[PDB]
Amino acid sequence: DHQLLRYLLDKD
Amino acid sequence: MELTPDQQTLLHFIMDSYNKQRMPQEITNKILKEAFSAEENFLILTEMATNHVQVLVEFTKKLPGFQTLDHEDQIALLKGSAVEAMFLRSAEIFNKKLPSGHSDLLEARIRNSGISDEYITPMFSFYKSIGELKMTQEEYALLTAIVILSPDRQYIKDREAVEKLQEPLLDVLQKLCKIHQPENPQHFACLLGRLTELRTFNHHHAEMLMSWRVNDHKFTPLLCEIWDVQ
């Protein structure tokens, strides 16, 4: 669980 | 052997992604202009490292097949590579040709930044060794991609799939070494050796930030995620 890392990965 | 059109296409695409980073001139002009306190330099480090990761995630996502990987493997790859990538990048910047004396002043500045002396020696020893390698931008970009796509990262559930991804980048880098440095057949192996040298910095990363000569060590929440801090 690393929301920002997962957010940066998934977004776009 | 020479690059095939498909490796040339791959290399160019990789460079495009890679060029999206903050210019090294920007960074060295900031350090060289005025000297700062340890607290001020800590701030610059956290910002620089915050922007470095954001760019790194973008570079990583553009790597061929990266998005085909298991979600949890992708995370373990980013965490496993962020610090090493930042150090390899710091080494690239350090080695950019500057007007006479600036090289010496940048080193002296960084040396005063606030980092403990235990880390300055292995840090500059690495930078000056990497510098000796005389790598092109392409070599830094491919070696960065090679570092990110390491099957050997702790927590990788399918090493085999990561190996399939890193495999074509290793081949391209090797060809560049034979092209750009054919008076040194050991060149490619030296590059791979320096990667083992990079992992050791990663082992002590949290300590080197924790030991920075400052009272309070405040990190952005993104940095707390990448860096095993706070």
Ligand SMILES: O=C(O)c1ccc(NC(=O)[C@H](C2CCCCC2)n2c(-c3ccc(Cl)cc3)nc3cc(F)c(F)cc32)cc1
């Ligand atoms: O691509 C990016 O966007 C990017 C990547 C990397 C850095 N790195 C930095 O700003 C820090 C500063 C940070 C401010 C204080 C002086 C060093 N930095 C480190 C260092 C030392 C120790 C630790 Cl723990 C991490 C790093 N070694 C450097 C060698 C250099 F020649 C240099 F110019 C800056 C350097 C900047 C930007």
